[PDB]
């Protein structure tokens, strides 16, 4: 025995399934139409929606 008595602390991770409750129309979500922004690379183009 050395003269001291260490105390160890560690963190463990658990994989969890959660359930959520929310009320009817508890938040109103305002949206518009999805739009396309063009970004042309040369050999192919990418369209951002």
């Amino acid at each position: 025995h050395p003269g001291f008595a260490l105390t160890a602390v560690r963190t463990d991770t658990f994989e969890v399934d959660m359930l959520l409750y929310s009320g009817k129309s508890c938040t109103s979500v305002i949206i518009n139409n999805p739009i396309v922004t063009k970004e042309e690379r040369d050999i192919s183009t990418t369209y951002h929606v």
Binding site: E40, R41, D42, I43, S44
Partner: protein, 285 residues
């Protein structure tokens, strides 16, 4: 709406494997000697310029003349090449020994070392695309290895050349080929080294006479310090037509160095992917 492409045709008959091999190069940098609309397969790539007495210096000088085209489409009986225009964005294949990163300035170099396509006594040797610092380092390595070429009887010199020969860059190391093959240096590298040494030698003797006279006048008090430095290097160790001849020789040797002294940027990079084989770049002429 169509675009202005170049048409290339092959005299050789192609197998399905050859065509599939071409379709993998649909963004490569294929140089052409002249701006033509219909060319034969022989004029693609550097294979037409290969010789067994010339080296990297000659091929670098020849590459600077050519027109750089990107392959665009591959089909039976045809290859479509696009000649890019300055300031526009293009996709280019990474074929050199080094990984590119965004913001790089790329330049075209002769190659120093499924596979690539050969048909007859034919081969599709594409140029190397590397960032500008790597090309500059490679050129300086080759020049110094050329200057050491006459002391190769000693092991100290050979260790020096083996240190010159290996180069390290972004997570890659490769060994450039020694310009000395069969114990003797090729004529193009020989001329490059001889011109470098001649410009140095001519400057060493010629500059003092002019520096004295012009430093007498120089209000910048810079040329006096220049003459002092010349006096120092002197201390460490002519007919007028001959003065004209030596000045003309100095400037002609400098013009001989011009191919190596400076290299052009042809692209600048902006794209990143696991697909790293390619990137999108803007073209520069």
């Amino acid at each position: 709406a169509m675009e202005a492409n170049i048409f290339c045709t092959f005299d050789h008959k192609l197998s399905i494997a050859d065509v599939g091999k071409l379709t993998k190069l649909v963004a490569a940098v294929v140089p052409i000697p002249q701006r033509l609309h219909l060319i034969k397969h022989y004029q693609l790539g550097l294979h037409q310029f290969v010789d067994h007495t010339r080296g990297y210096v000659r091929l670098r000088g020849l590459l600077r003349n050519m027109t750089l085209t990107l392959m665009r489409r591959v089909e039976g009986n045809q290859i479509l090449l696009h000649v890019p225009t300055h300031g526009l964005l293009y996709t280019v294949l990474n074929t050199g020994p080094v990984t590119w990163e965004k913001g790089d300035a790329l330049c075209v170099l002769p190659p120093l070392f499924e596979n690539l396509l050969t048909l007859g006594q034919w081969e599709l040797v594409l140029p190397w695309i590397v960032p500008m610092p790597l090309a500059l380092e490679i050129n300086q390595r080759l020049l110094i290895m050329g200057l050491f070429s006459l002391d190769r009887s000693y092991e100290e010199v050979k260790a020096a050349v083996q240190q010159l020969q290996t180069i390290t860059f972004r997570d890659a190391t490769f060994t450039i080929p020694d310009p000395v093959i069969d114990q003797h240096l090729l004529i193009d590298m020989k001329t490059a080294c001889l011109s470098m040494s001649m410009v140095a030698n001519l400057a060493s003797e010629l500059t003092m006479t002019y520096v004295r006279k012009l430093a007498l006048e120089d209000s910048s008090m810079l040329l006096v310090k220049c003459q002092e430095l010349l006096m120092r290097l002197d201390r460490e160790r002519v007919s007028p037509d001959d003065e004209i001849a030596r000045l003309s020789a100095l400037f002609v040797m400098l013009r001989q160095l011009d191919d190596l002294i400076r290299e052009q940027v042809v692209f600048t990079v902006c794209d990143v992917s696991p697909d790293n084989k390619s990137a999108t770049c803007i073209f520069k002429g």
